[PDB]
Design a protein around this ligand. Structure first.
Ligand SMILES: CC[N+](CC)(CC)Cc1ccccc1
Ligand SMILES: CC[N+](CC)(CC)Cc1ccccc1
Ligand SMILES: [Mg+2]
Ligand SMILES: [Mg+2]
Ligand SMILES: [Mg+2]
Ligand SMILES: [Mg+2]
Ligand SMILES: [Mg+2]
Ligand SMILES: [Mg+2]
Lengths: 326, 326
């Protein structure tokens, strides 16, 4: 199982190997315009109030608070001009979902695996975390068109399932012993664990973005952009924690190349997705502009937040005093 | 909207265009071994008993009974040596899901669009069809490992959502006016409407196939195999009904080629998927043999069933007296 999150130590040799790729990737993504923030202090007030309402602990310097700061920053950087109820919704979703994402390290896979059957039977979840996530999934329907909320929910449920699959020894065995012809397995797991489809659709809540038809052709590329950008830049922190049965390493295994080759390919794949999204969204009004600010903000979130430890690689920013893991 | 299903007339020019492609495809698929059936009369007794219990009408010579015969034959041909409770489960799921698949022609999009939020809130569904589908989705957990059942459910929910999306004018508009860089949209819709992931996993119920790790690398190729084989061989019946905003025509639109080019490519994509699955499953015991019988049976289901009208193209079998639409 992976180690728990930490702010201590690191891997200087891996950081030296990754810094050149990471610095070139940040430039070559060429995400414009510059990221924006809006009503940042009002957002923090409203996020902390909602967080209190869930009952889920988020003490300063905890893993939970680290994840709350990821969710705050996701909304602040990626959805700056969105309705504040939507920004809080995404911040809180991202807090809870990133804790679930760490379920193997936290020892909560058993209840994560049982979440979906309890959810569709109306059985209350066993923990404060999972009751808050279930309530957050139901809240999606207040803010997103029902078809879009439907897709957000199936993507969110697939997170829990794929996180549980990678916790299985027989699934970790695939990376060590890849089957000939099995190359699609890397994206099979990554499409489901990465929640790229949910995060793509979060850009387009129904009141401000009432026409789901306008950006839909781009969703797949937005999903892959989101998943692949994180696969490149979270490789460092995943290596530190031993959570290395990931898309990069699975890709390297099926393609018979090393992690560095899969990182370079995945970096180029991210750029190719970003350029296709900008072609599809050319002349699509507020949809085009909202996506552009989401992509630019999403790169900066990784630069900024302690979850990704990028200050250690020389491309990120030092953590805030309360976000450092104690 | 598409016309209702019929057994009358056809399109002799389209049939003459497709027959050579279809006869070559049936050979080139080279699906071995020969398809098998087992306890066919006992399965029909059990399927009709369960169908009665749902309350969903299935009168002889109705669209519903045509779909019940697809579900029967799906189980009979593709899961011959599976537990009869699993064969009945798949037949009844297929009956109800293929009626849902026709929701636009039937005028029930409003109900299918609202199914998932009702389902996750524990609200009753508004029609006997959808109450039976909701009950069938919950039954999945008695027969499949919870992670596998989880994936079947998300794939099932995505069917309803993607069927609803294609009913929208702004989604039909994409095929007429494809956006540059939008090529992934064809598979975005087809991954979600095709239920290929559910039908892949139906092969591996938990009592007979207790290790989900064994075939998992193949699921994506089994998903595409299922979707693409149908996209080729159902193009005739979809053309007759005017349900032509499909994977073949979306692919032709984004690639800038005609339907015949997209059909030829999709046929080769099917064969490529079938070969990769047989590589990944080489030496995987009862998993490998169960998949082989499912693929061979799945081609024969399209040959035999009135839903696909392939007797009109010269590659299918004449319908049974009770399955002809009146
Ligand atoms: C690729 C996933 N993500 C969000 C888009 C990267 C920042 C983190 C995340 C993982 C799992 C659950 C929720 C968020
Ligand atoms: C490709 C979809 N399918 C299932 C394998 C092919 C025969 C029919 C189907 C469509 C929609 C719902 C249920 C079944
Ligand atoms: Mg993670
Ligand atoms: Mg994860
Ligand atoms: Mg990551
Ligand atoms: Mg159909
Ligand atoms: Mg369909
Ligand atoms: Mg079809």
């Amino acid at each position: 199982k992976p180690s728990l999150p930490s702010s201590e130590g690191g891997d200087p040799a891996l950081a030296a190997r990754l810094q050149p790729l990471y610095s070139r990737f940040l430039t070559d993504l060429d995400l414009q315009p510059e990221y924006r923030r809006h009503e940042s202090e009002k957002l923090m007030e409203e996020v902390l109030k909602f967080a209190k309402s869930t009952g889920v602990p988020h003490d300063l310097n905890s893993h939970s608070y680290q994840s709350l700061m990821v969710g705050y920053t996701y909304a602040d950087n990626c959805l700056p001009y969105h309705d504040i109820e939507v920004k809080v919704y995404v911040a809180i979703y991202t807090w809870l979902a990133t804790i679930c994402d760490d379920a193997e390290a936290l020892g909560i896979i058993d209840d994560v695996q049982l979440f979906e059957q309890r959810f569709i039977l109306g059985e209350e979840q066993p923990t404060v975390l999972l009751r808050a996530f279930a309530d957050q999934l139901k809240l999606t329907y207040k803010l997103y068109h029902p078809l879009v909320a439907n897709l957000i929910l199936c993507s969110s449920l697939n997170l829990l399932t794929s996180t549980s699959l990678v916790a299985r020894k027989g699934i970790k065995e695939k990376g060590d012993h890849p089957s000939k012809g099995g190359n699609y397995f890397a994206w099979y797991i990554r499409e489901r664990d990465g929640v790229g489809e949910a995060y793509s659709w979060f850009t387009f809540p129904k009141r401000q973005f009432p026409n789901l038809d306008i950006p839909i052709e781009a969703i797949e590329d937005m999903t892959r952009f989101i998943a692949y950008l994180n696969d490149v830049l979270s490789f460092y922190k995943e290596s530190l924690a031993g959570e290395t049965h990931n898309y990069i390493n699975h890709t390297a295994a099926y393609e018979g190349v090393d992690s560095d080759a899969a990182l370079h390919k995945t970096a180029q794949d991210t750029i190719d997705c970003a350029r296709r999204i900008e072609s599809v969204l050319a002349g699509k009004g507020e949809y085009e502009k909202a996506w552009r600010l989401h992509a630019s903000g999403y790169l900066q979130m990784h630069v900024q937040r302690g979850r990704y430890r990028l200050i250690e690689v020389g491309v990120g920013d030092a953590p805030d005093v309360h976000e450092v893991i104690k």
